[PDB]
Design a protein around this ligand. Structure first.
Ligand code: MG
Ligand code: MG
Ligand code: MG
Ligand code: MG
Ligand code: MG
Ligand code: MG
Ligand code: MG
Ligand code: MG
Ligand code: MG
Ligand code: MG
Ligand code: NH4
Ligand code: NH4
Length: 387
RNA sequence: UUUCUUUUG
RNA sequence: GUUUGCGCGCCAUGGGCGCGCUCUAACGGGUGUAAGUCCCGAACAUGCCCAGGUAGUGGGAAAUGUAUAGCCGAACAGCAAGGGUGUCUACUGUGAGGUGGAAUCUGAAGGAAGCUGUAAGCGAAUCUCUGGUCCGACGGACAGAAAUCGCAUAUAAGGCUAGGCUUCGUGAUAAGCUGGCAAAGAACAGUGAAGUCUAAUAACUAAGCAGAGUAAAUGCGGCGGAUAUAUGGAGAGAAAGAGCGUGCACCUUAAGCGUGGAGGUCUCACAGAGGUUGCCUAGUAACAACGAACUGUGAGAAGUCAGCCGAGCCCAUAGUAGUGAAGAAGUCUCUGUAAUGGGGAUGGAGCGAAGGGGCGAACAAUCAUAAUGUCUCGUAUUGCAGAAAUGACAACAUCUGCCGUAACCAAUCGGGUAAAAGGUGGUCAAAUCAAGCGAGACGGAAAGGAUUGAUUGAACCGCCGUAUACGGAACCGUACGUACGGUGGUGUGAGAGGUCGGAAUUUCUCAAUUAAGAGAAAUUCUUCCUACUCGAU
């Protein structure tokens, strides 16, 4: 009923295109992703018969390419009907769902009143889970033992099958969230339960830790299991705050997200990096493009102004280290529009690099407009047009 | 905001 | 491929060693046998304070200058022999080229042992104590080595910049430290260790704390050593210092003087070897390849001269220049280092170059040369859903944030957060039966066995010892400064030309005028070669 839908030729061509677009690692064989076409040309119908007769041993550990490919086939066939039993407020590893929808929904709930955060960390997912409960959970909606057999062989030994299986296993948690009547948002394994009282939140946390320990068979540790306000919650990289104009909560990038971004910006604009500065500007604009495109729902305007100023100052000392010789430095300064005596005065302070690049003549020698034409996207324009 | 020289990836 | 960078010889204006002569503390005194040393005295100018912000007067506490014989000479200025150019012009050569002019750059950290004048700086045996700096390699500080100890150090020690907050509100001398960091110096600015010295007079018109920012990596402490940028001081010290002149079979020196330049490259003239209807012998950087454009003899010109795996042999100037009897090679013998060495005695003549190529030992890297247990048929079962004949009972799952309070609430007032008041589901055990996938045991049919050779090492970063020179004592540099010895570290820059060697690609040939099956023409990538042009040291 389902096994030929697994081995539909169009489904395997979709799995083919997906795994060659993934460009994954080699696994344990050392087999390359560019040679799976041969692996289907001469060793394809053998694998089809082996799966249809249940003789395949998927090779464990480091995930190989053909294992990933048939895993993508099983994920592509189970992205249908088992999806419709999922609750609406599960937002990870699903089609047409991103983290921004989860953030907007959570913001709607806390702006509707429920503001006490129950954070539960279902840590270390696939080495604490009981196997046979997961198999009978699959079998609660499936009947073909071929699918059960292949996922059982895979479970003892990456692609999309492991996140799909996690979303299947924690779907009972969302079912219980609905039946208890609670407000919650779960991304993929870290769920936040959203209630409007403190004693209620402590009761919910102890009830759900006992419910997880007893019925669903997982384990929760004490390293990210707190109850706190949105003033102290980090969730998917988003911190939360409340506006002084007291009507709505708002979401912002968390401080550790900004610290990671600042580490990446400082490494990409390392002063002693022996590459062209246009290469640095391209890698930068890649990074602000992605990083704004993640946090584009958050109020971040002051953060972009400060980070943009920091980016421009870092590129100024990158330019100043690139020129590197004071005669070349004064030559470039008088080329860029500085009068000669002051240009040679600042160029014969070619060292003290932070001191020169922080203020003075080089802020107008290489300004906002020159670095804008040079190829850099200023943060505020991209944030305003994206939000 | 030192009207200076040299050395290095 | 970074102005110069090679060998040999001469020469001090460099340095020792003596011998004389003179001078040595503003200007003068004393003390003493003896003062260059020890002690004392006058004025002016500057710095600092008499402030409340500054100029100009009046005054004052330390300090410095005019002011020791003299030394040195800026990252100061001018001159400047010499060198270069791919810019132009003259001349001379048959030509490769040469020479003289202009114009410009250079005249350098290693010998015109460059010249002149400065700013600034320095300025006396020896001894005790002490501050600071530097050193005891390189190597993110392992390994490796002759090359300090312990600890810390990259999601970044430590330093530093601009702030913020909390405590709090005499100077001088001056090596050094820092000025947001690759390293080092100089200038300027701010601070400034150690001890000493002062702690006088009158007026006027800072320590901590958290952050944020910034790194081509070192930081802190001990121990040992050095310290003439005449290192900052302190205490002894009747102690030496400086200039000039002169000797010394004294010792040395990369841009000074003289003289050599092989090897390769290039020009010309004769002969041959060709092409052409007497003339051509090249060009494309060289290799290659087109092309007739190659070969010997002879005459010429420019010219060398950069450690990276290289002991050594070979080619040529060449056993020549040059040294050597004011004594070589060899031998013997005391020694020194990690290594290169240095004396003493015989002995009787030898010793002995330069650049560029080949060959290459050694070295490094790379490549080639008797179970157990799984596949596999049956047995006892067990891991996990669903179904409920039926029993045990009204206590259990689950959601809901509070009682009074100043007449009003977030402990904004006192106790508490499974805090009161509450809702919603009834809760647990199943007899037996039972989906689909497995998990090992229990058995037996079938397997199965725990030295040689080639290639590469292109280039580059350096440090250390001695000798020898400089910028700038130390440190950083001068091609690792150079020479000779020791040592680690990285890995094959872009173009262009050739190899179009090897692999793919387009088009033909064969197989069938069929493949990504073999061959050929072309295209692209790749291996290799080339300072030809750049790039790096
Ligand atoms: Mg250098
Ligand atoms: Mg003076
Ligand atoms: Mg050292
Ligand atoms: Mg080091
Ligand atoms: Mg730090
Ligand atoms: Mg002194
Ligand atoms: Mg000549
Ligand atoms: Mg070499
Ligand atoms: Mg050095
Ligand atoms: Mg160098
Ligand atoms: N040179
Ligand atoms: N070097």
């Amino acid at each position: 009923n389902l096994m030929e839908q697994i081995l539909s030729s169009d489904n395997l061509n979709r799995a083919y295109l997906q795994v060659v677009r993934n460009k994954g690692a080699e696994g344990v064989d050392g087999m390359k992703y560019t040679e799976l076409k041969e692996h289907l040309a001469k060793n394809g119908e053998t694998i089809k018969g082996q799966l249809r007769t249940r003789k395949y041993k998927p090779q464990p550990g480091v995930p190989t390419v053909t294992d990933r490919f048939i895993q993508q086939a099983i994920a592509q066939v189970l992205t249908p009907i088992y999806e419709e039993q999922f609750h609406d407020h599960s937002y990870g590893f699903r089609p047409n769902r991103c983290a921004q929808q989860a953030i907007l929904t959570a913001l709607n709930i806390m702006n509707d009143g429920n503001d006490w955060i129950v954070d539960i960390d279902l840590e270390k997912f696939f080495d604490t889970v009981n196997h046979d409960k997961l198999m009978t959970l699959i079998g609660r909606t499936i009947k073909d033992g071929d699918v059960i057999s292949i996922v059982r062989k895979y479970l003892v030994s990456g692609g999309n099958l492991s996140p799909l299986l996690a979303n299947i296993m924690l779907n009972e948690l969302d079912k219980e969230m609905e039946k208890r009547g609670l407000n919650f948002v779960r991304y993929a394994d870290d769920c936040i339960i959203m209630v409007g009282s403190e004693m209620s939140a402590n009761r919910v946390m102890r009830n759900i830790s006992r419910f997880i320990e007893e019925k669903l068979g997982l384990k929760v540790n004490m390293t990210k299991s707190k109850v706190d306000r949105p003033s102290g919650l980090k969730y998917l990289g988003f911190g939360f705050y409340f506006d002084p104009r007291a009507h709505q909560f708002k979401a912002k990038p968390h401080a550790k997200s900004v610290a990671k971004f600042k580490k990446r910006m400082k490494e990409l604009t390392c002063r002693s990096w022996g590459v062209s500065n246009s290469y640095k500007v391209e890698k930068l604009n890649q990074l602000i493009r992605g990083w704004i495109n993640y946090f584009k729902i958050g109020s971040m305007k002051t953060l972009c102004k400060e980070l943009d100023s920091r980016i421009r100052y870092r590129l100024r000392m990158c330019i100043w280290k690139q020129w590197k010789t004071p005669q070349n430095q004064e030559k470039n300064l008088v080329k860029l529009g500085i009068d000669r005596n002051t240009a040679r005065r600042v160029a014969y302070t070619g060292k003290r690099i932070a001191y020169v690049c922080n203020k003075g003549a080089v802020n107008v020698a290489i300004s906002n407009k020159r670095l804008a034409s040079f190829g850099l996207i200023s943060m505020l324009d991209y944030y305003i047009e994206k939000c």
